[PDB]
Amino acid sequence: TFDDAGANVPLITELANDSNVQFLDQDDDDDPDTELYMTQPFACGTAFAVSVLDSLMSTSYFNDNALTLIRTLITGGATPELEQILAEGAGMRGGYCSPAVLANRDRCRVAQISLFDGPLAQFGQGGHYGELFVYALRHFGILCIGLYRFRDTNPSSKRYVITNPPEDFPLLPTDQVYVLTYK
Amino acid sequence: RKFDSTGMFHWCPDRPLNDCLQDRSQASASGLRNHVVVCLFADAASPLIGLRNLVMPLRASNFHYHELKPTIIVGNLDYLHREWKTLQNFPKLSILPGSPLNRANLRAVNINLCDMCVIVSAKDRNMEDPNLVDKEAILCSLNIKAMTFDDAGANVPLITELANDSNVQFLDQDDDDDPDTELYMTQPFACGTAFAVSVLDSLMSTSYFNDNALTLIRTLITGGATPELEQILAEGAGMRGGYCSPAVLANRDRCRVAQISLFDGPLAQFGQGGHYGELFVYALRHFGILCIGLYRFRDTNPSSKRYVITNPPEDFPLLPTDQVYVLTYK
Amino acid sequence: AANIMRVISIKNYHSDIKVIVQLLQYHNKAYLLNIPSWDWKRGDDAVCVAELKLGFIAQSCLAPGFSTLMANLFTMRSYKPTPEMSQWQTDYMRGTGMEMYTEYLSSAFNALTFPEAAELCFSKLKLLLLAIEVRESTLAINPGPKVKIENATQGFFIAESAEEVKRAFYYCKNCHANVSDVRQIKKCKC
Numbered sequence: 057t058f059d060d061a062g063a064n065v066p067l068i069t070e071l072a073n074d075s076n077v078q079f080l081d082q083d084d085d086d087d088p089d090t091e092l093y094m095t096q097p098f099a100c101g102t103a104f105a106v107s108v109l110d111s112l113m114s115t116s117y118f119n120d121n122a123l124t125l126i127r128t129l130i131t132g133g134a135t136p137e138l139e140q141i142l143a144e145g146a147g148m149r150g151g152y153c154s155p156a157v158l159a160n161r162d163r164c165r166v167a168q169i170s171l172f173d174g175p176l177a178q179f180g181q182g183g184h185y186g187e188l189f190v191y192a193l194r195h196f197g198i199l200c201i202g203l204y205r206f207r208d209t210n211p212s213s214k215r216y217v218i219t220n221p222p223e224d225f226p227l228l229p230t231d232q233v234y235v236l237t238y239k
Numbered sequence: 240r241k242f243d244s245t246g247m248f249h250w251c252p253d254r255p256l257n258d259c260l261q262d263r264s265q266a267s268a269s270g271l272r273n274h275v276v277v278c279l280f281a282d283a284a285s286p287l288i289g290l291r292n293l294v295m296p297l298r299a300s301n302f303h304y305h306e307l308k309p310t311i312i313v314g315n316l317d318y319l320h321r322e323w324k325t326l327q328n329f330p331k332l333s334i335l336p337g338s339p340l341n342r343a344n345l346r347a348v349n350i351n352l353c354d355m356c357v358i359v360s361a362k363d364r365n366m367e368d369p370n371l372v373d374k375e376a377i378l379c380s381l382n383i384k385a386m387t388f389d390d391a392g393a394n395v396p397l398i399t400e401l402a403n404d405s406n407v408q409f410l411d412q413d414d415d416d417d418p419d420t421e422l423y424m425t426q427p428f429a430c431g432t433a434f435a436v437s438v439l440d441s442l443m444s445t446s447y448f449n450d451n452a453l454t455l456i457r458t459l460i461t462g463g464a465t466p467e468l469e470q471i472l473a474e475g476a477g478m479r480g481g482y483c484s485p486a487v488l489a490n491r492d493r494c495r496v497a498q499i500s501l502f503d504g505p506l507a508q509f510g511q512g513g514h515y516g517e518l519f520v521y522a523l524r525h526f527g528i529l530c531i532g533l534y535r536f537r538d539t540n541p542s543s544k545r546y547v548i549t550n551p552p553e554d555f556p557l558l559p560t561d562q563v564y565v566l567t568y569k
Numbered sequence: 570a571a572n573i574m575r576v577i578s579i580k581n582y583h584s585d586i587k588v589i590v591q592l593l594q595y596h597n598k599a600y601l602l603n604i605p606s607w608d609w610k611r612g613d614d615a616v617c618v619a620e621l622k623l624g625f626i627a628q629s630c631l632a633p634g635f636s637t638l639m640a641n642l643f644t645m646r647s648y649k650p651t652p653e654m655s656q657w658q659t660d661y662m663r664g665t666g667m668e669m670y671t672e673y674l675s676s677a678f679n680a681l682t683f684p685e686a687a688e689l690c691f692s693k694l695k696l697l698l699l700a701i702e703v704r705e706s707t708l709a710i711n712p713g714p715k716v717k718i719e720n721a722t723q724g725f726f727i728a729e730s731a732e733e734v735k736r737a738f739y740y741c742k743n744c745h746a747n748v749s750d751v752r753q754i755k756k757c758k759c
């Protein structure tokens with residue numbers, strides 16, 4: 057308790073055994089028949105476990121550049137030159153740099169924008185995903201790749217991911233949108 | 240100069256290790272060239288490998304002090320404290336702490352300018368797995384061959400002490416690996432870049448059947464460790480010694496094994512088309528030098544690898560790129 | 570250490586084999602980089618479960634939930650609606666069905682800027698386009714109006730399956746593709 061809270065604080069837990077995911081949460085109807093990706097803590101993004109990476113072996117054989125796309129997003133830009141520089145055993149060297157290289161200080165980041173207030177709010181009140189996608193890319197140069205929606209509406213704080221919803225998918229003013237943005 | 244009590248080795252008074260200890264800045268500030276690097280793998284707990292036996296032949300008194308190859312050991316500091324008690328009487332010796340796999344350590348000792356790098360491991364074989372037992376010696380050998388040294392790489396001279404002979408497969412490429420092949424036939428052994436303790440196991444026989452042939456070996460490979468020196472060491476004082484009588488200093492002349500190139504120099508003549516035989520004769524005759532074999536390039540027409548040829552036939556053709564193993568008195 | 574040996578043994582047998590290796594600690598990845606034939610440009614790779622795990626979790630600090638976005642994106646799964654499953658679970662499940670795929674954009678995309686090509690994919694094709702291979706080779710994520718689609722540009726897409734993404738290859742522009750059941754899209758005469 058943090059009075060001048062509690063279950064409202066944002067958490068992510070790295071699990072070592074996936075089946076221990078049952079104990080991270082309540083009001084969630086635990087069943088060990090259920091594989092990790094279907095469980096409520098994983099759908100909410102509060103639970104990560106190393107097992108969900110084991111498909112990356114396949115993805116490499118079948119699309120190497122899709123792993124390089126992952127590696128560039130999730131590392132924030134660890135290029136082959138940096139791991140060469142680290143393999144030289146000196147540690148990260150570096151100091152004020154040429155504006156030249158500094159040019160790469162502009163990269164796409166994944167980010168979250170809320171539809172509660174702001175230009176996009178309009179789409180929030182009844183709009184459909186589709187509209188947003190278009191308006192956004194068009195006016196702001198921002199791709200929308202999914203939603204982070206409250207699980208309860210009518211009352212817990214938990215939200216869940218929705219990857220790339222349909223064009224006619226209805227929005228709520230409380231939704232948050234995952235986006236790729238250049239600034 | 241000072242020498243040990245039998246005059247067989249160059250010598251210096253004791254010293255604490257911190258006199259020979261260096262960091263990377265000190266190593267790279269020192270003018271290390273034509274030196275020997277020992278890449279030592281050890282835990283602080285590992286058994287003593289006896290590096291005195293490595294350093295001592297490189298300090299035989301039949302070398303002038305200016306031609307003694309300086310020596311730097313890269314490895315675990317706590318292990319080297321335990322061993323230093325044996326090393327402390329040899330001159331031109333240095334220690335750089337930390338892993339030999341660390342490319343900065345290697346770059347700081349000028350690894351590209353050494354006359355040889357020795358990869359040696361001291362860690363235990365209490366390890367159950369015959370594939371993992373050499374993993375550091377293999378990784379170190381490969382790591383050194385991959386570096387770049389622009390103002391190189393696979394051109395730097397290496398010798399690797401293997402703990403399991405069958406791991407010799409991984410030391411080299413373009414070599415057609417086959418585990419049916421016993422160690423002495425493999426390319427790394429024929430090139431002299433790979434040594435393993437198994438090739439010594441015949442020395443039991445050689446002793447029973449010719450004791451003096453082992454004493455001939457022992458006098459060459461140790462640089463002259465006589466029975467009197469191992470008596471003096473068994474007294475538990477360590478190597479005593481100081482400036483010595485010219486008398487004993489007389490033994491500062493012994494035969495050494497050495498390498499002479501037929502590229503330029505008096506013997507060059509034989510190089511251009513001659514046959515081994517001729518050289519043997521000319522040499523012994525004019526220089527008092529026996530020729531006992533050749534160290535020939537494997538590729539001609541283009542890699543740097545060379546191979547040994549023990550005592551070739553009289554009519555065996557020479558090349559201007561050959562190097563000759565010789566026994567020489569000066 | 571055992572997996573580094575294997576990689577050493579495989580490369581020792583023949584250099585040009587593409588090797589993909591799983592590592593459980595980044596501090597060991599270096600070793601592999603030295604093997605004298607690891608060539609990232611050739612295809613060799615090292616999926617490091619540490620680098621990736623902690624990485625995903627990091628991204629989730631900057632954008633909560635991301636790690637469950639991406640993890641689902643890189644595992645193959647068909648959508649399977651059922652009774653006995655809540656509204657939020659059906660929406661989540663539909664999302665877990667999608668995976669990342671890659672395909673060559675059709676000739677109809679030539680000289681489009683990337684934003685209008687991506688708009689065209691979402692609106693007509695029912696595919697989401699993230700990124701393109703730009704010809705030397707490089708990968709560009711959501712590039713601005715300055716970048717235009719060259720011939721045989723490879724795109725990266727999110728879709729329910731490989732059968733879905735092929736529409737972006739067969740799409741023949743206004744020469745054929747003007748009917749709203751996307752299912753219709755198929756290899757045009759010219």
Ligand SMILES: [Ca+2]
Pocket residue numbers: 077078079080081082083084085086
């Ligand atoms: Ca639970």
Ligand SMILES: [Ca+2]
Pocket residue numbers: 407408409410411412413414415416581
């Ligand atoms: Ca080999």
Ligand SMILES: [Ca+2]
Pocket residue numbers: 645646647648665666667668728729730
């Ligand atoms: Ca799918």
